[PDB]
């Protein structure tokens, strides 16, 4: 469940 | 001999023993109910000899009373396990239908495996007997119903080679087969689309043979192939409603019958060569 | 811990709002709010998973209560049926053995 | 799908459950 | 009874403690109120079925035959009522037995009279729908086993008609909602197609429940365990499993 | 009543919401209010339902244990009564037929 | 729970 928005974040890094 | 043997019913209700069966190299181990027939004959003998004026010991009468107060669950368990073994042998006779009743076999095996933990003197023995007997009777009648419909389905499939080449009789036969599959789908057997597709490949092969026969009998060309090519396909899960998708022409009619041509595409080349 | 459809749906709406707020202003909006949201989101799934266990335990133990009550009542009744047949057999065959005793005494 | 197990291995497992308890 | 059992336990454990002071020991007890207890048991086992018959009779039998039946029911209850049933004496017991026999003969005569009042069904009902309606109106008379046994040649035809309707609705559900004309007629009446499908399946389920109500009415109580009702109930259950609308709603929500 | 874990996580998102409101503008959370109050109300209501289920669970488990024990004692009494009955049966019939062979003598 | 975030918002708008 934590993976979803972590991916949300790492899009531009 | 009875006071030497020391009968009595205890332990859990089921019993898994292993016997060496002739015709099978390994031992085949079976399921039996922990209630010996010697207990029942002892109950009959105690009820018989007591009226005869023959004095029986107190432990023998105690065992007989404990047996007679535990008999109605035991006979029902014996009947259920014998019906289950008979029906499992009946479905093992025809290997073509094993995947159709996997759900019922799973349910009955789950009810057996739950029931293997129950001791004879447990309080839970009253509703478990009724539930097991109801489930086993339902499983047996479902198996017999499917045996009858599978025999009829095999008859209707084998009647397709002797059916005359016209759209009306082909449509009627496929309508009967679709209605039988509808009857299968109403009672919700397991693995229905896989078995329906396995039927559908065989019926597409048979229709390819019949299309080959009609094409070499042709040797208005377009009208003769629409007799087979516009036949409606067999739909497994047709009872569902609501999904607003449309099946394509390949999955609605037998539009791949030319690929199922047993002599390759050369019969279509031989048909077009005469024009 | 299997996620339900309802928690996945509202987490999808949270994902929508978080993508909208990321696109609208900057990255720095989400960087402390999403760890304070994801633990609550895990807590929703945890409390639903515990609640369904509570429900199935309630149903099985309830039906075991109604099994116990009627089984005890039937067992009490069949103890009573043992306890007057004793009395009837007792005084009947005691009267017969007493009449046998006095007829053998004379 | 649905694939109920073979009866033999199933009731050997149940025989083990009979023996262990 | 329970206080007497506890006291009898006390007499047992005192007489086994008083063996050397007693030579003869019997337990002959015949209490005088047990015959009274049997009298009130028989009085409830009259009054319960009398109330059950009489409430139904004054409820649903609203011809001079019906007035004759209710007057004979009142006459039977008054003929039993005029006899003092509280007497445990022998002459009162025989008067009670005679009143019971007279009440039973009157009730059986009334039962056969209303059976003949119910056997004119073919001479009245020319179509199965009004026979359905009069069978629904007079349903509570079929708790009696004689009335239930009297109607057997109608029940088979009614079951066959219901089975034909169930098969017809099965062929209605054989086509799907996109191929149906109902989708077109809902779209021309400004119904969105998801909600139109939900509506269509719910009205099919409502018709199925109405036919289940009809077969419950025709076969009386315990219809699910009947010879013909078992297949009907099983197929109704299996059809209602396929008529739910939760998954399409969930897919629309997704 | 508001539960304390939901109150603490609520305070966490309250200070986070204050940070985002003071940091950029007032439209940061204008589309975030009825989502987050629904999520917190969901957690509170399901936890309250769990709280009801726990106490009714402990009540029915307790009198379940009591009913099991009293039914086991009733089993013991019933079996003892049947054994006493069949023993008294055999003993009295035994000396009764000893009396009638004494009669036939 | 509405009132509290409501205050959050109107406290300075």
């Amino acid at each position: 469940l934590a993976s979803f928005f972590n991916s949300l974040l790492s899009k531009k890094t | 001999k009875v006071q030497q043997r020391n009968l009595g019913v205890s332990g859990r209700i089921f019993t898994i023993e292993s016997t060496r069966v002739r015709g099978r190299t390994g031992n085949v181990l079976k399921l039996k109910v922990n209630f010996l027939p010697e207990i029942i004959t002892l109950s009959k003998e105690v009820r018989n000899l007591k009226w005869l004026g023959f004095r029986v010991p107190l432990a023998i009468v105690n065992k007989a009373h404990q047996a007679n107060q535990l008999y109605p669950f035991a006979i029902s368990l014996i009947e259920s396990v014998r019906t289950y073994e008979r029906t499992c042998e009946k479905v093992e006779e025809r290997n073509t239908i094993s995947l159709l009743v996997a759900g019922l076999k799973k349910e009955v095996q789950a009810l057996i495996a739950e029931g293997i933990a129950l001791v004879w003197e447990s309080y839970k023995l009253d509703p478990y007997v009724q539930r097991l007997a109801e489930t086993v009777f339902n499983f047996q009648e479902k198996v017999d119903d499917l045996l009858i419909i599978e025999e009829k389905i095999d008859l209707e499939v084998r009647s397709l080679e002797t059916c005359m080449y016209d759209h009306k009789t082909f449509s009627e036969i496929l309508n009967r087969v679709q209605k039988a599959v509808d009857d299968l789908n109403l009672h919700s057997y397991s693995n229905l689309p896989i078995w329906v597709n396995k039927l559908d490949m065989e019926i597409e092969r048979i229709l390819g043979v019949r299309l080959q026969a009609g094409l070499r009998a042709w040797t208005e060309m377009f009208a003769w192939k629409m007799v087979v090519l516009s036949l409606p396909r067999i739909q497994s899960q047709r009872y569902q409603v609501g999904v607003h998708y449309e099946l394509t022409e390949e999955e609605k009619f037998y539009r791949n019958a030319l690929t199922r041509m047993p002599d390759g595409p050369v019969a279509l080349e031989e048909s077009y060569s005469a024009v | 811990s299997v996620m339900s459809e309802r928690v996945s749906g509202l987490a999808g709406s949270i994902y929508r709002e978080f993508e909208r707020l990321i696109h609208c202003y900057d990255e720095e909006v989400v960087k402390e709010l999403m760890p304070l949201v994801v633990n609550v989101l895990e807590n929703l799934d945890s409390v639903l998973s515990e609640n369904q266990e509570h429900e199935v335990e309630l149903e099985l133990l309830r039906e075991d209560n109604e099994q116990l009550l009627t089984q005890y009542e039937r067992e009490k009744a069949l103890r009573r049926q043992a306890e007057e047949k004793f009395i009837e057999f007792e005084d009947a065959l005691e009267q017969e053995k007493k009449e046998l005793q006095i007829q053998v005494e004379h | 799908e649905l694939a109920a197990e073979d009866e033999q291995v199933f009731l050997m497992k149940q025989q083990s459950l009979l023996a262990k308890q | 009874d329970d206080e007497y059992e506890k006291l009898q336990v006390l007499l047992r454990d005192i007489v086994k403690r008083k063996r050397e002071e007693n030579l003869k020991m019997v337990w002959r007890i015949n209490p005088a109120h047990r015959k009274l207890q049997a009298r009130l048991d028989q009085m409830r086992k009259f009054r319960r079925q009398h109330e059950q018959l009489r409430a139904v009779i004054v409820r649903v039998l609203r011809d001079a035959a019906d007035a004759n039946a209710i007057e004979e029911v009142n006459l039977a209850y008054e003929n039993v009522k005029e006899v003092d049933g509280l007497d445990v004496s022998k002459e009162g017991t025989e008067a009670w037995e005679a009143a019971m026999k007279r009440y039973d003969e009157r009730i059986d005569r009334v039962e056969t009279r209303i059976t003949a009042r119910l056997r004119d069904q073919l001479g009245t009902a020319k179509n199965a729908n009004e026979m359905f309606r009069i069978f629904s109106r007079f349903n509570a008379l079929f708790v009696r086993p004689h009335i239930r046994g009297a109607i057997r040649e109608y029940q088979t035809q009614l079951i066959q008609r219901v089975k034909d309707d169930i098969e017809s609705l099965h062929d209605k559900f054989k086509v799907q909602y996109p191929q149906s004309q109902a989708c077109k007629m809902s779209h021309v009446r400004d119904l969105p197609p998801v909600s139109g499908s939900i509506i269509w399946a719910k009205q099919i389920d409502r018709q199925l429940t109405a036919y289940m109500k009809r077969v419950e009415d025709v076969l009386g109580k315990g219809w699910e365990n009947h010879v013909e009702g078992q297949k009907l109930k099983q197929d109704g259950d299996s059809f209602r499993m396929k008529l739910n609308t939760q998954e399409i709603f969930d897919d629309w929500a997704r």
Side-chain angles (χ1 to χ4, degrees), chain A residues 2, chain B, chain C, chain D, chain E:
Chain B
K1 294 314 122 189
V2 172
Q3 264 177 325
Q4 163 193 351
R5 166 65 195 83
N6 295 0
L7 285 210
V9 46
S10 314
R12 325 215 302 250
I13 51 196
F14 285 137
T15 287
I16 301 288
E17 308 305 281
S18 152
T19 86
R20 192 155 136 168
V21 190
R22 267 293 105 212
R24 262 74 74 210
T25 313
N27 63 91
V28 185
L29 84 176
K30 276 88 51 186
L31 162 53
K32 292 164 300 308
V33 158
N34 206 7
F35 211 80
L36 296 156
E38 280 155 60
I39 274 290
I40 322 176
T41 62
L42 171 153
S43 175
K44 290 156 169 207
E45 281 233 66
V46 162
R47 206 251 328 272
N48 257 342
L49 293 167
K50 208 157 45 81
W51 144 84
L52 274 180
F54 279 11
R55 177 205 206 278
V56 281
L58 259 297
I60 304 313
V61 186
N62 274 283
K63 282 162 47 177
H65 192 45
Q66 262 96 69
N68 275 355
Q69 80 186 128
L70 257 187
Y71 191 55
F73 315 122
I75 170 55
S76 178
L77 257 60
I78 285 158
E79 284 320 289
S80 281
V81 71
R82 263 169 80 257
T83 320
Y84 174 69
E85 257 157 14
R86 181 60 217 161
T87 319
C88 266
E89 189 64 36
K90 217 189 286 179
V91 65
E92 211 50 57
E93 180 258 307
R94 276 190 194 179
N95 327 73
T96 59
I97 56 185
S98 181
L99 77 149
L100 256 166
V101 278
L104 308 165
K105 275 202 60 184
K106 177 155 293 159
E107 172 65 82
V108 174
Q109 274 159 339
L111 208 32
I112 291 315
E114 164 294 339
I116 212 150
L118 273 191
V119 84
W120 264 116
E121 305 98 19
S122 152
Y123 71 88
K124 290 168 155 187
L125 224 52
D126 183 37
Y128 164 69
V129 161
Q130 314 305 309
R131 196 204 278 101
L132 173 63
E134 156 68 34
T135 312
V136 160
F137 278 0
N138 172 54
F139 163 67
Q140 187 214 351
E141 81 166 330
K142 281 304 185 272
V143 161
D144 296 316
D145 159 14
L146 169 162
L147 263 284
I148 292 303
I149 305 191
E150 192 259 2
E151 176 258 9
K152 183 226 69 55
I153 271 291
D154 210 336
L155 175 124
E156 278 293 325
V157 156
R158 293 313 148 85
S159 87
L160 259 198
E161 294 90 87
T162 185
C163 173
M164 300 306 198
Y165 202 99
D166 62 88
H167 191 74
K168 178 62 141 32
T169 58
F170 273 165
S171 67
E172 279 187 43
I173 285 181
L174 280 293
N175 178 262
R176 289 205 296 272
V177 170
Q178 181 52 67
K179 215 37 50 193
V181 172
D182 201 300
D183 212 342
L184 268 282
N185 198 24
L186 190 43
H187 301 141
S188 84
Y189 291 87
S190 43
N191 322 333
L192 194 73
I194 312 185
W195 186 82
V196 156
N197 184 37
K198 197 201 299 312
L199 174 73
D200 212 60
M201 306 317 334
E202 273 311 287
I203 205 167
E204 212 178 47
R205 190 195 57 96
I206 285 302
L207 270 286
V209 168
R210 293 289 320 201
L211 171 55
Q212 199 171 73
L215 215 58
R216 314 271 280 261
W218 178 266
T219 313
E220 272 302 306
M221 150 76 87
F222 32 67
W224 200 238
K225 82 202 165 154
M226 306 344 299
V227 168
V228 46
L229 265 290
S230 64
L231 284 184
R233 276 191 105 110
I234 291 304
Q235 311 307 104
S236 82
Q237 284 266 89
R238 74 140 291 290
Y239 255 129
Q240 37 87 26
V241 80
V243 187
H244 275 214
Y245 90 102
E246 276 262 26
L247 294 106
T248 77
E249 53 160 47
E250 273 78 23
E251 49 208 8
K252 201 161 301 291
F253 308 97
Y254 299 96
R255 212 70 48 75
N256 213 248
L258 308 160
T259 73
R260 304 287 289 195
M261 192 46 68
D263 302 322
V266 73
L268 192 51
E269 316 293 327
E270 276 180 5
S271 70
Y272 263 118
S273 172
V275 199
Chain C
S1 285
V2 178
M3 45 306 300
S4 92
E5 42 90 24
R6 164 141 180 250
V7 61
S8 184
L10 40 63
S13 54
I14 293 174
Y15 196 85
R16 284 190 153 143
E17 188 60 40
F18 273 37
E19 285 258 7
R20 179 141 211 164
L21 282 174
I22 275 174
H23 154 63
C24 268
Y25 301 138
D26 42 76
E27 173 253 344
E28 268 64 27
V29 178
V30 57
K31 75 200 174 305
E32 321 104 323
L33 180 54
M34 72 67 68
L36 296 178
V37 162
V38 65
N39 51 356
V40 185
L41 260 292
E42 288 153 353
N43 273 237
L44 265 293
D45 178 44
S46 173
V47 70
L48 260 302
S49 183
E50 179 72 28
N51 190 270
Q52 73 65 30
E53 304 290 337
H54 270 56
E55 298 326 291
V56 316
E57 289 318 288
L58 163 64
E59 306 317 307
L60 67 93
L61 85 85
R62 161 173 328 93
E63 70 78 22
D64 156 77
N65 303 121
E66 33 271 18
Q67 194 259 40
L68 260 282
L69 183 54
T70 88
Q71 190 161 151
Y72 148 77
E73 198 86 13
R74 152 197 317 121
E75 181 151 286
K76 169 207 304 302
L78 85 84
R79 190 164 73 89
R80 301 292 54 72
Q81 293 323 339
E83 279 318 294
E84 41 281 354
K85 148 197 59 54
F86 193 110
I87 305 304
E88 171 185 356
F89 162 75
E90 170 181 346
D91 44 24
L93 208 44
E94 274 283 340
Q95 157 276 0
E96 183 173 351
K97 74 185 303 310
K98 186 61 63 56
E99 71 88 14
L100 203 144
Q101 176 68 269
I102 172 55
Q103 73 65 50
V104 85
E105 271 288 343
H106 96 277
Chain D
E1 64 169 331
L2 257 162
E5 49 262 62
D6 173 52
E7 195 143 302
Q8 301 318 294
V9 51
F10 150 76
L11 68 98
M12 301 205 98
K13 177 172 64 82
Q14 295 303 316
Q15 164 209 22
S16 70
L17 269 283
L18 256 167
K20 92 179 301 171
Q21 163 72 286
Chain E
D1 290 319
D2 55 59
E3 287 282 84
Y4 176 62
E5 180 49 44
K6 295 150 68 89
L7 183 58
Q8 207 267 352
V9 162
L10 199 41
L11 285 304
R12 285 279 152 115
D13 50 49
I14 189 135
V15 297
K16 195 33 52 183
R17 223 202 53 237
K18 206 169 103 43
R19 165 52 270 191
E20 44 264 22
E21 302 95 331
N22 162 266
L23 258 302
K24 164 255 162 172
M25 201 55 267
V26 308
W27 304 92
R28 270 295 312 121
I29 307 99
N30 186 23
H33 79 121
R34 322 292 291 274
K35 310 147 64 59
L36 209 39
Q37 174 172 32
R39 177 62 54 91
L40 326 161
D41 168 293
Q42 182 176 18
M43 199 164 21
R44 176 162 60 170
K45 284 312 310 203
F46 152 75
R47 270 210 84 178
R48 166 195 281 105
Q49 38 281 59
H50 177 267
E51 191 40 71
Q52 150 201 318
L53 182 124
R54 203 236 60 233
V56 163
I57 272 294
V58 305
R59 254 174 37 90
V60 313
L61 268 283
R62 154 64 284 159
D63 209 313
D66 319 333
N68 179 36
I70 67 178
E71 210 275 336
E72 284 272 329
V73 159
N74 292 323
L75 264 184
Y77 197 40
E78 283 295 322
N79 256 9
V80 155
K81 182 212 198 51
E82 81 160 9
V83 177
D84 186 25
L86 288 180
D87 193 20
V88 80
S89 92
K90 299 324 277 173
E91 34 92 10
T93 313
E94 292 118 20
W96 184 252
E97 291 338 281
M100 281 324 317
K101 285 291 298 310
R102 185 160 59 253
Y103 170 78
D104 272 3
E105 288 333 283
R106 195 148 295 198
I107 275 300
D108 294 328
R109 262 186 294 275
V110 164
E111 165 255 301
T112 48
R113 278 191 215 88
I114 65 69
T115 320
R117 193 55 220 185
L118 265 282
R119 281 310 301 276
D120 47 16
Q121 192 157 14
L122 299 191
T124 45
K126 59 218 86 45
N127 164 333
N129 294 57
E130 72 261 4
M131 162 185 318
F132 253 125
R133 219 264 321 157
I134 196 51
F135 210 96
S136 266
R137 172 162 211 204
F138 281 178
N139 183 37
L141 290 322
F142 312 148
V143 196
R144 327 285 278 101
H146 324 122
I147 315 295
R148 151 171 303 128
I151 310 298
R152 274 310 330 290
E153 75 257 9
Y154 298 166
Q155 281 168 356
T156 67
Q157 312 161 18
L158 266 282
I159 287 304
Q160 205 43 64
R161 214 263 185 185
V162 167
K163 278 164 99 138
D164 290 3
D165 291 12
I166 286 301
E167 215 205 308
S168 151
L169 171 146
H170 282 324
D171 318 334
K172 155 100 56 172
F173 206 45
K174 163 74 192 192
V175 312
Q176 320 269 43
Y177 188 60
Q179 301 323 108
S180 69
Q181 217 162 26
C183 180
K184 308 313 159 270
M185 282 338 268
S186 76
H187 183 30
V188 81
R189 289 205 171 268
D190 203 338
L191 257 285
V194 169
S195 150
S197 69
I198 300 309
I199 281 300
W200 190 67
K202 282 250 178 168
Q203 306 270 239
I204 289 299
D205 172 82
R206 201 138 282 103
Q207 283 312 114
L208 181 77
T209 318
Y211 285 158
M212 289 343 299
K213 154 79 141 184
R214 262 183 174 175
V215 64
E216 171 260 356
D217 210 313
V218 153
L219 258 292
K221 75 227 191 307
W223 63 275
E224 313 93 299
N225 311 300
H226 212 261
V227 163
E228 307 96 318
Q230 257 150 22
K231 311 298 293 314
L232 266 289
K233 172 64 190 134
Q234 281 324 107
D235 288 333
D237 163 38
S238 66
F239 201 53
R240 204 161 286 147
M241 191 73 68
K242 306 275 183 249
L243 267 178
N244 84 301
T245 42
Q246 192 61 40
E247 49 267 49
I248 169 55
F249 166 70
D250 288 16
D251 188 52
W252 172 86
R254 148 199 313 133

